Amino acid sequence: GSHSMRYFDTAMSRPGRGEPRFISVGYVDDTQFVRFDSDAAPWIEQEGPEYWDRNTQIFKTNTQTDRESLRNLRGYYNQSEAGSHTLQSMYGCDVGPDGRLLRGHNQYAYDGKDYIALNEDLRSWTAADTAAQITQRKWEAARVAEQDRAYLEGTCVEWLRRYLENGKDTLERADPPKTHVTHHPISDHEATLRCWALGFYPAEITLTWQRDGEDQTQDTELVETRPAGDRTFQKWAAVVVPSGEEQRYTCHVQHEGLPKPLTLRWEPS
């Protein structure tokens, strides 16, 4: 019954080719609801003109702060203005079934590497290296964590509860997976069993193969959960099995939308 709201921000310089690419994507659970892009859900559309003017203004100002960060970062690492660099951050809050704050988040990455993160107490920072320690010092003096904390415990939790209510029909409802097992012989003795899960939401799901009731955790090829293209997700797990002893193998599907975890097994007509 718990939910989350998270923003995924990007700032990537493009020296000699144009201005930096700035992006901000907001999600509630696994649903994207807003996207700001310098290069550019229904329940968010109902937000008045002030909501959009204000958020757009925040994004614009945020990109200016990012321009400042990018150039300070270049100085810390003594980099030239010639190479492209990327500044990223993820922030948001997690609330329990009662709509109450469980934990806040705010971390930054420079060129794909963890840089500095606001600790769970939303009062202290964890810097990744000496450069991030310069940032940490600057932010402790400016009491940045207090400002971020105010947002995470207040604004963040408040609007997530609002979005959860405004879009309840799609948000607090999970889509069960459509499953099927496939068989494809690798040879006479060994074959292949692949367990499929399609059209489910949220993305969270567990697929495990077991034989004689024991998880074949080590002989299971599990792929990364992928988007179907229609808000739902897909995923499969494969395992090799000897011809004939296939009924000895079962696929166990765990998912929020399922009334009870499935114990599937392959088949022909």
Binding site: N55, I58, N62, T65, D66, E68, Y91, A132, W139
Partner: peptide, 9 residues
Amino acid sequence: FLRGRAYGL
């Protein structure tokens, strides 16, 4: 709702 960040790294 977006958070405004005023301090750069």
